[PDB]
């Protein structure tokens, strides 16, 4: 008998859609062929990066006594990190603002 | 009449409920997270495609994606993304 469907995401233990990632890899004109483990590996990487950014933004929101993550929290989380700020240095986040930063020589005394 | 517009909103939200069960997320933060996911996806996929073309390979494998990740993600981002992806691929192969 036909087995009940079990998503490749669940097989890998991921939240992100391994099947959708594989579809995008096939449709994106990246290569003639796409190995079976490539969308799994990529979905895991995307899940890791998304989880990291969301967790830093949630920490920033908790420190600001806000329940819901906002673009300000995302910007704070991304810019407050050397590696994320190197990854997304060229990126602009809408309504993210800027880090509070005043040069020492401008401050009085 | 309307048509389906796929997005990563549900997956971002389901990852959020793991990293911070009680914390919510605004719609604009969802949009920014969608843009981030798409951008990183295109970066890694393009780098893997270029690696395959450089090696004359026609297929993109987990080794291609791993090399793209190590090239793009700086510092410990590369190490931890490699570890996460390797764990996921190993679990997928075992199951």
């Amino acid at each position, epitope marked *: 008998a036909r087995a009940k469907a079990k998503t490749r995401s669940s097989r890998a233990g991921l939240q992100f859609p391994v099947g959708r990632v594989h579809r995008l890899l096939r449709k994106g004109n990246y290569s003639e062929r796409v190995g079976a483990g490539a969308p799994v590996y990529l979905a895991a990487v995307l899940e890791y990066l998304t989880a*990291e950014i969301l*967790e*830093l933004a949630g920490n920033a929101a908790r420190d600001n006594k806000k329940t819901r993550i906002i673009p300000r929290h995302l910007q704070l989380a991304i810019r*407050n*990190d*050397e*590696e994320l700020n190197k990854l997304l240095g060229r990126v602009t986040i809408a309504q993210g603002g800027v*880090l509070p930063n005043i040069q020492a020589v401008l401050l009085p005394k | 009449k309307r048509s389906r517009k796929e997005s990563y909103s549900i997956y971002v939200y389901k990852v959020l409920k793991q*990293v911070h069960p009680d914390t919510g997320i605004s719609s604009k933060a969802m949009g920014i997270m969608n843009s981030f996911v798409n951008d990183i996806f295109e970066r890694i996929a393009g780098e893997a495609s270029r690696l395959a073309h450089y090696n004359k390979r026609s297929t993109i494998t987990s080794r291609e994606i791993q090399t793209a990740v190590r090239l793009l993600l700086p*510092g*410990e*981002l590369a190490k*931890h993304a490699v*570890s996460e992806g390797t764990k996921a691929v190993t679990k997928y192969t075992s199951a």
Partner: single-chain antibody
Amino acid sequence: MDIKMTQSPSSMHASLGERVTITCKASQDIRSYLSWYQQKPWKSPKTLIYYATSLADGVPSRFSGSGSGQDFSLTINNLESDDTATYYCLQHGESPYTFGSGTKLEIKEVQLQQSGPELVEPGTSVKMPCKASGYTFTSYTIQWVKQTPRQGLEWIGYIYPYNAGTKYNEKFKGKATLTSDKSSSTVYMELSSLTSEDSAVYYCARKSSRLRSTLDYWGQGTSVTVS
């Protein structure tokens, strides 16, 4: 409110080649952000397991961590004479990082240059330098850890040289204040109003800004003695 870590086995005795398992209990869920360390006496602690399951760089597969949530465990499969040391769990999921009480086990190039022992009199101040080499100084936080022979390991606080941001343990506000010098790759901890209680060995510890990253490389430790 600080998360209590409860290493149930205070000490074990074992022979060569047989398995030894050490466990930890948390007071609150830390979501796998727990590490295991090996400290041989009068040496700096070395990390073995990070993220509660992953092996550290260059540590053999003999060490196997397991668990999640509040219950965690450490396994050593093939014991050797060298394995006689003290093992500490470390949670870093919540802001005050907490080390375990430590389990004693008896069996029958990143550099952090830290200053030597400093004798000091009470009420004055002492400033301990950290000279970081072999890596991108700004990309990693420097974690400072205090080790008494009576209260075990205590996490003091950290500085992020990338943006000079600091976070302190509430037990050490005012007592400790951290500064950084990018031009010399040097991080300074100063202790104010030294007291006999402050007699302890202080370790600097590199830790990446990544949340799952642990305190991986440790300075040799500066012993501060208050008369």
